[PDB]
From a paper:
In domain swapping, two protein molecules exchange “domains” or structural units connected by a hinge loop, such that intermolecular interactions replace the intramolecular interactions at the dimer interface of each monomer. We show that introducing the QVVAG motif into three different surface loops of MNEI results in domain-swapped dimerization, generating topologically-distinct domain-swapped dimers of MNEI. We then show that engineering the QVVAG stretch simultaneously into two different loops of MNEI creates two swappable domains in it, resulting in the formation of a double domain-swapped dimer.
Mutant variants of MNEI were designed with the QVVAG segment engineered into loop2 and loop3 (L2MN and L3MN, respectively). SEC profiles of both L2MN and L3MN showed two well-separated peaks, corresponding to the hydrodynamic volumes of the monomer and the dimer. The predicted torsion angles indicated that loop3 adopted a β-strand conformation in the L3MN dimer, in contrast to being a β-turn in the L3MN monomer.
Numbering used by the authors: 2 to 97
Write the structure that this text describes.
């Protein structure tokens, strides 16, 4: 895995909306209203450990406000677009 911080622009905010949408299906935290994704947002790029030295997927680690509480959500993304999954959604957590 390799790590980088990405901005919290539209792509990142939409990851946050996805996370909230998916958590609403579960219902652990009742019915949440997405507010906004705040810094820092981390992107993990996952590589196959042997040649051809290749990317097998991504994971995003977000701090997202929903219904005015702060949550940590981890989201996986496949190489073939449109395979996103909510891995973890935990909180409330203290601010970064």
């Amino acid at each position: 895995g390799e790590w980088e911080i990405i901005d919290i622009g539209p792509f990142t905010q939409n990851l946050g909306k996805f996370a909230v949408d998916e958590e609403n299906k579960i219902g652990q935290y009742g019915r949440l209203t997405f507010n906004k994704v705040i810094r820092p947002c981390m992107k993990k790029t996952i590589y196959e450990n042997e040649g051809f030295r290749e990317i097998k997927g991504y994971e995003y680690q977000l701090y997202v406000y929903a219904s005015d509480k702060l949550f940590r959500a981890d989201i996986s993304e496949q190489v073939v677009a449109g395979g996103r999954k909510l891995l973890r959604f935990n909180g409330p957590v203290p601010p970064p």
